[PDB]
Amino acid sequence: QVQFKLVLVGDGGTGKTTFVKRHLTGEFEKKYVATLGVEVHPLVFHTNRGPIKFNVWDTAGQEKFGGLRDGYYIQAQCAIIMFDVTSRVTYKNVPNWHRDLVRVCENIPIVLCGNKVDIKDRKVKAKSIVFHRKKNLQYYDISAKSNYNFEKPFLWLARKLIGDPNLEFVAMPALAPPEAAQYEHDLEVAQTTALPDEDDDL
Amino acid sequence: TMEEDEEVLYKVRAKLFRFDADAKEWKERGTGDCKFLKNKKTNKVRILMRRDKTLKICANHIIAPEYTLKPNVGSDRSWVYACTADIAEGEAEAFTFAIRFGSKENADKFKEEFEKAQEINK
Amino acid sequence: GSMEGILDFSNDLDIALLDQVVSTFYQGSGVQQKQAQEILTKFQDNPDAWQKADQILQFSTNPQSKFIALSILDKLITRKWKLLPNDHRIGIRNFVVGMIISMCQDDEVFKTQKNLINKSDLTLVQILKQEWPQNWPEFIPELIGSSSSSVNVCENNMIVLKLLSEEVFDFSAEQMTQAKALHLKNSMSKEFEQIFKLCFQVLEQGSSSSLIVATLESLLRYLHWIPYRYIYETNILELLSTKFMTSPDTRAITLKCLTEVSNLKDNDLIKRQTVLFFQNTLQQIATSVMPVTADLKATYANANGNDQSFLQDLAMFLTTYLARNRALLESDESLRELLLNAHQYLIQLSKIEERELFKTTLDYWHNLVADLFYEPLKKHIYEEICSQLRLVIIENMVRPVENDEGEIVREFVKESDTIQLYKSEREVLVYLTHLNVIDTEEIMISKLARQIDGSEWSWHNINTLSWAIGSISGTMSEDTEKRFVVTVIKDLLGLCEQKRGKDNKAVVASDIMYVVGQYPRFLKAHWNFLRTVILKLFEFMHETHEGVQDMACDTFIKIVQKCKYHFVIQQPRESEPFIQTIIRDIQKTTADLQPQQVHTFYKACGIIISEERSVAERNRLLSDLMQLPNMAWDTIVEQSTANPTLLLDSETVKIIANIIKTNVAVCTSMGADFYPQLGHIYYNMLQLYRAVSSMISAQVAAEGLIATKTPKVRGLRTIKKEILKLVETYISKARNLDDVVKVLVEPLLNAVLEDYMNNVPDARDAEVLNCMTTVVEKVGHMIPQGVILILQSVFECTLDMINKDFTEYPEHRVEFYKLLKVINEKSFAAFLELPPAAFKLFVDAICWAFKHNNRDVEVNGLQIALDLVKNIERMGNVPFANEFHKNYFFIFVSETFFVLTDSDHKSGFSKQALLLMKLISLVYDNKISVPLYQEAEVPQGTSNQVYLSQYLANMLSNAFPHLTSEQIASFLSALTKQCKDLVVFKGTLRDFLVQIKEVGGDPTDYLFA
């Protein structure tokens, strides 16, 4: 099986776990429950070069919850460094995270992501984001909330890891699908629980 | 893709939710094109829906005639229904789905197409 | 479980069991991996786990186990080193040193366990930060001597020195006190001449590529700080720019080294060497890597080996050097080929498809063309470069936000990430156009002719060209612009009459709309053509074309914002000002638009009407414009004034919301001129607000809180929110404040305040607070009793909503503190009127705001406290100010200290420090009149300065008991002395934040200033 260890680092509350959960289940988690150490999630994308599986090590950004810290980076084959464009301090800390990461992983593809561009009051201005240049990191504006560019970090990493610049995500095969006591209860509860974000476009 | 011997009866942009009964909250499962697909060999109509930009399947189940579209208290542009065999994520699993559209008119169009597909499947 | 045995420290540590849990964590999966993770973290967190590090590093079979042991040592060294007995310090040192030595003498271990060796080197560096040089003076001389005994030791000593340099010069500012940073920097500086000796001899002598790379990696770090003589008075620049450019293993790091040299700090010899290493470097690229004609776009796209990173690094080197030094290349005719060849590589790099790399080259081009714009006699040097650059930018123009069609000739989401790139492309292209307007026009006209009668027709050939044409508007003087635009428009009109189909039409229509929208000066001078454009946009408002219809609305208001005057005057050969023609047809013109687009249309009409300064004529135009919504309004207030059930018609709720949204739109652009229309609806509008509010409360009562999520109640609350938005919008722009106070404010407060107060929390609209903020902001000084009523109705009930967690009711949270801020600013007397219990809640609410991580709340809370301290100080020596200080001075001091030190509110450091400095300075200026202590507590006549120091010493002693008394006293003495110099004050606070993270911080550190 083709599988790659990916470490995700960044200040607490930048949206690392929300971003991964979006890719895992499609959900958007509004609550902030801080990661305790690391959570490991397998994540598969289908490409024209076959399936690619990322073992995503979603590490804690809060220092008091940091766990093994750089011990998580051992044998990572790629990485995402996350910050929050509404919080300047999280960009200020990007060189520290990068420092600790490349001391363990000296030659891996790394994506820098500025998350939460859906928020109107942006604080880390586009023109300010230059740290990736001397460090050969790929950069993307992203929003786990709006899905803006949300596929880009994984598409770029897969291209670098497979060694194919023409790699593309492709549509999964769609098998033909198969052809009342607890149900009326659950349906009632579901009808009477309001859908979230009723003001969104969808 | 396994969609080559199927005809596109209906397509609409939508957002799909799944009900987490334990957490008592709706969770998004995917945003993209919801398609009603009729199999040229069996004449059976399925819902098949894929996420934008990852193209991952978030709905794959027969539009069974036993299903009923019901309103959600918070929306005039959504439908709720119980699905007993969705294979988007592997083995067939039962879900309570909600699907929301860009407008009430799209939601009402989805409903009549959903019911017509149910008659085809008979 | 079996794996938790390693957590029992009474028994000896089973190293085999440790290794199994570690392997389970790294190479396992699922539940077992998660269990092992939690065990390993508990093991690492054990405060005596370090005592087992030697046993793991000696007996373990698993390098990850040894890594984890080294992480445990790192925490001990960095946080508790000076608490250890001296024998344990020496033992840890000798033990780390000897482990590094043995890994480097074993060729097999040195080659396979780089991860563990690097972590060991960094661990040693942590020891150095604690022990060197004062308790290790011979470290550098011994390192240098041991280097010549083994290639492996020598190479690893370069890694240690690299890490030490990073820790001392690159990452010290936030991890060490100012004093300790200076000590370690001075120490490295005093011994660098020896270090450089070894580094230069390795580079000139060595052949081991791995040793050379490591030496060069360490040199990269040194270049951040070493004196320039080490770089220019040696032969090292020749080695970097020739030898180490030829081999690809050293080329990457050498190029990065030469980029930093292009940043080191009248000497004609130095200029010659700066020219020379550049010439050497470019010669090596041309002969060893690729010639200047090479297709780097293709090479990058292929992405072989490290080609992408090398091209990135080459762009950085060339842009960095040329931005600083191209003047050295510009006068000497013998250097002209070098100057242009370097810029030709940059042209080739600018053709690569890589957004972030393009921004890097574009930044350089901006730097260049802005210098050619001003510097005499320079632009002619770069004529051919600039001509090629015009082509590159015109062909890589990104979408200009206003263009709403894409891909399949459809609409979407906004391309948020391209806004800045377009602006940067526009900036350079505008400069390039000024540099040679003939060349730019010739290029654009020619591309355009080959769109029509040419082999180049496509989308993104018409698109990127149309966007470039629009983007240069203003670069030509008016007469040249006139001829250019006439040519472009005819030819775009040619393309649209002949390309047919949904897709073609949408593409060309968007391009024409963008261009004409970008040339309002041309429109102002040709009224007859402006008319035809406006009428064409009205046609497009009936387009089934998704995309085109929305863009026509945006283009209409974009044009009106610039050309409004020509709609308000009466044009020659017209029967009427054109604003009249628009208004008379507004039902038909907008008939097929969506409501938000209708409101945009009305907003644009209001822009035009406000140009009319004859008040009688303006008000008549406003009445004419609002004729349809007012007649709908009159009818609906007639119907729903007898059947509050009809107000439960969803259709009727949408109509009302849209009527008010229309008023909001016109008010936005008309501002103070909107008042006559506001007065037409005001009384009935507030009656409707009350009626709608009764319905919402009734629905919540009959259906439960869930009713607030239903479409009906959301629609009813939309009415209330838009009514609040309309009033806020007018009052924020009002010029006659007397009418605001005497006509608007009393009915508004009657309508909204008790409804807010008397609704359940989930039914309260945060927009009430937002409206009240503007009310207070504009006329608060004229309504002191009205501000009191606002506080009475919203203060305590909103505070109770938001004071149980930091997450619930986030909008109420943000608007709450904006309201308190403006009241504290503008009508502070209102807080003086509060009963003591409520004033105590006010202080609680302010400190509560402190503890938010939400910047939208934290910043206002810190500001409120500062303004409040100032408000109190302005009162002078009066009973209320004396009581305030006795009750709340130390509450503000301690709460401010708490968020300064808890590591969870670093985003507010600067304003926390400002507030703390203000508080302390109050006492050391004796601006507080009464004793801050109780009569018992301390001797009579004890100064508040003495008591404050006493209070703070006690506070910090109990909050940070690992500090020594002398650390605390030295800290406070420095802090107090510095309460008039914010930058020094802040450095002392930062020194304190470092010291509380460890044991045994030097109290003399606080003398740094």
Ligand SMILES: Nc1nc2c(ncn2[C@@H]2O[C@H](COP(=O)(O)OP(=O)(O)NP(=O)(O)O)[C@@H](O)[C@H]2O)c(=O)[nH]1
């Ligand atoms: N508006 C917005 N909110 C987001 C976005 N992404 C994440 N969030 C929100 O930010 C908060 C933090 O979520 P989380 O994923 O736990 O961040 P984290 O980096 O994992 N924190 P930690 O490192 O401590 O575990 C959540 O409330 C989440 O809803 C986003 O893209 N937009």
Ligand SMILES: O=C(CCn1cnc(-c2cc(C(F)(F)F)cc(C(F)(F)F)c2)n1)NNc1cnccn1
């Ligand atoms: O005839 C055209 C020509 C195509 N065409 C596209 N766009 C345009 C166009 C757009 C603008 C706008 F303001 F919108 F930017 C202004 C102007 C003009 F210069 F005339 F003032 C023209 N013309 N289109 N419509 C129809 C209708 N029936 C049959 C065929 N085509």
Ligand SMILES: [Mg+2]
């Ligand atoms: Mg997390």
